[PDB]
């Protein structure tokens, strides 16, 4: 399975002029592009080494699309103010996420699309991709506008064809690394809390993709998965254990890059 | 590529 996802953020800046707008693109768990109207070069630019070769042709189209979206989101922010009855003074946020997913067979599985206003769900494209549904009551006028203008058609065209088409193009361009599975390097650390209690921590380091399960065999702390910085991820699990017998507790690492699920022990 | 059209809410 593979997915092409974009995340768009517009943030009004009443003090300035145009709202801040940022678009990021992802193939699976790997960023490959970005647009940021505040950057030195306010254009769609490569964010992975395998995107350097694309010519003026591709980046121009993507900059037009990003700048056009920015310019519509600016209009939207103004209009959304009028739907809620908020002041001109406050800053607000419009977010937009769209993505398509392929199945094991590498063909279209599902497409999704939704809008958020101030981090709250606003408007969602239905699963059949043929109509929009309001998730906020304030979104009813936008829901009807979108359904009346047959907007879903353009998005269905995007999610079922254009998104699918390009995802395959990207997957070929990023051949070397996108299909590469990086297994985690795993270990266990000891940290005494007291004379009666101590901490055991199961580490998963330098893996790709981000998907991973770390279980312990109820005082279990589990951090949100984090980026290492070189496209690989890190994650740790921690369990609180009575000081003495720690060997009744074992860590279990399920991840795609491993031949078989791995058990960790802590070597004192 | 990103979606070439958005909604005018």
């Amino acid at each position, epitope marked *: 399975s593979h997915s092409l996802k974009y995340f768009h953020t517009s943030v009004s800046r009443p003090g300035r002029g145009e709202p801040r707008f940022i678009s990021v693109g992802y193939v699976d768990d790997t960023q490959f592009v970005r647009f940021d109207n505040d950057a030195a070069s306010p254009r769609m630019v490569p964010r992975a080494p395998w995107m350097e070769q694309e010519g003026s042709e591709y980046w121009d189209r993507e900059t037009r699309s990003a700048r056009d979206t920015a310019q519509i989101f600016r209009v939207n922010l103004r209009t959304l103010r009028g739907y809620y009855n908020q002041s001109e003074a406050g800053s607000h946020t419009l977010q937009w996420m769209h993505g398509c997913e392929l199945g094991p067979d590498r063909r279209f599985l599902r497409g999704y699309e939704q809008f958020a206003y101030d981090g709250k769900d606003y408007l969602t494209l239905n699963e059949d991709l043929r109509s929009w549904t309001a998730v906020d009551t304030a979104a009813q006028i936008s829901e009807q506008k979108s359904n009346d203008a047959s907007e879903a*058609e353009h998005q269905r065209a995007y999610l079922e064809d254009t998104c699918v088409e390009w995802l395959h193009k990207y997957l070929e361009k990023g051949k070397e690394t996108l299909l590469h599975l990086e297994p985690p390097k795993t270990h266990v650390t000891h940290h005494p809390i007291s004379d009666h209690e101590a901490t055991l921590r199961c580490w998963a380091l330098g893996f790709y993709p981000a998907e991973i399960t770390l279980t312990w065999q109820q005082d279990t702390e589990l951090v949100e998965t984090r980026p290492a910085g070189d496209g690989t991820f890190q994650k740790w699990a921690a369990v609180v254990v009575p000081s003495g017998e720690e060997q009744r507790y074992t860590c279990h690492v399920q991840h795609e890059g491993l031949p078989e699920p791995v058990t960790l022990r802590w070597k004192p | 590529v990103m979606a*070439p059209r958005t909604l005018i809410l």
Partner: T-cell receptor
Amino acid sequence: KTTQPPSMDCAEGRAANLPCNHSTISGNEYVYWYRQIHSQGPQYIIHGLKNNETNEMASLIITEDRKSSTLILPHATLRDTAVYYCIVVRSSNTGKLIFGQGTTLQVKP
Amino acid sequence: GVTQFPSHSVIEKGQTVTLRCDPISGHDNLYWYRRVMGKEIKFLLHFVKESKQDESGMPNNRFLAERTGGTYSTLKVQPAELEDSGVYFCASSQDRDTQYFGPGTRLTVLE
């Protein structure tokens, strides 16, 4: 983009089939047809993506390969004498129309 | 339907004309198109509400267009040159897929 025959003669009462070619077309580009009678405002007729479509003005036939189109006017009259533009428009936030030469359709009485 | 004023205009090289368009009320998008005698109809500008969404067809600086309250639009040529003679069509849309045109302003700049 898009080629149409520059002119077309047609008998009134019978159906008119106006061809259009767009072999470079991609999967998110839409086939539109407008017309202009004399020098008055251009007039939306119909548009489609991949399958055929019909309204009260006209019908559209798009091949399975998507490389060509046909506007069908059901029962041509003298009012139907116009330039007919076949315009391909890629999904965009503006939907800007590029008017080619179009087909000058003379409905001969 | 879309409305346009004036229907005709003949003015001297150097003079000013304001062309006006009254779109089907409720339409978020308004477009200006023109046909420069001898050529095809060509895009000028697209307003989404009161904002300029696309300006790529706007000839030069002598042309200026506004849509203050996102209703009627105005297109001002100052100063007018001969090559600006032609027909200027206004259009409005709700879906951006179906564009409705007014009858146009016929403009002749004479020397």
